[PDB]
Amino acid sequence: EVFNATRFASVYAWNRTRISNCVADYSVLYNFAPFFAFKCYGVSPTKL
Amino acid sequence: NDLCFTNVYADSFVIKGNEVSQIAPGQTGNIADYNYKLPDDFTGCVIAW
Numbered sequence: 001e002v003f004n005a006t007r008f009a010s011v012y013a014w015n016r017t018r019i020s021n022c023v024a025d026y027s028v029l030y031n032f033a034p035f036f037a038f039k040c041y042g043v044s045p046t047k048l
Numbered sequence: 049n050d051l052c053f054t055n056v057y058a059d060s061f062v063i064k065g066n067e068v069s070q071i072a073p074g075q076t077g078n079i080a081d082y083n084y085k086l087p088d089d090f091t092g093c094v095i096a097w
């Protein structure tokens with residue numbers, strides 16, 4: 001529901017959602033996007 | 049042309065455009081994880097045309 005949206009707000013008002021009380025398996029994040037840039041800084045994507 | 053190598057390996061495969069950027073040591077993706085993983089300590093060249 002953060003990648004299936006239709007109206008990702010403009011950068012002047014960046015919509016910000018809080019993710020808590022759940023289990024994160026980022027394979028869904030992987031298969032919902034033909035990625036162009038996955039630059040992570042604090043944590044490496046592989047063991048995420 | 050100024051180097052002497054013991055053994056040279058030439059792995060060849062045709063693949064999509066973005067997976068060209070995918071192929072690199074310490075990378076990830078549908079191809080980099082289940083199809084062709086380069087070793088992190090890769091000492092060599094990759095070529096795409």
Ligand SMILES: *[C@@H]1O[C@H](CO)[C@@H](O[C@@H]2O[C@H](CO)[C@@H](O)[C@H](O)[C@@H]2O)[C@H](O)[C@H]1NC(C)=O
Nearest residue numbers: 001002003005006007008009014015016017
């Ligand atoms: C940012 O985008 C989110 C997309 O999931 C919005 O979450 C949804 O918000 C609607 C109401 O607009 C809820 O009904 C729904 O359950 C879900 O929480 C989120 O609201 C949005 N935030 C802003 C500030 O636009």
Ligand SMILES: *[C@@H]1O[C@H](CO)[C@@H](O)[C@H](O)[C@H]1NC(C)=O
Nearest residue numbers: 003004005006007031032033
């Ligand atoms: C969610 O994603 C699917 C597949 O990309 C798409 O068919 C569907 O229209 C999307 N839903 C919304 C509300 O954008």
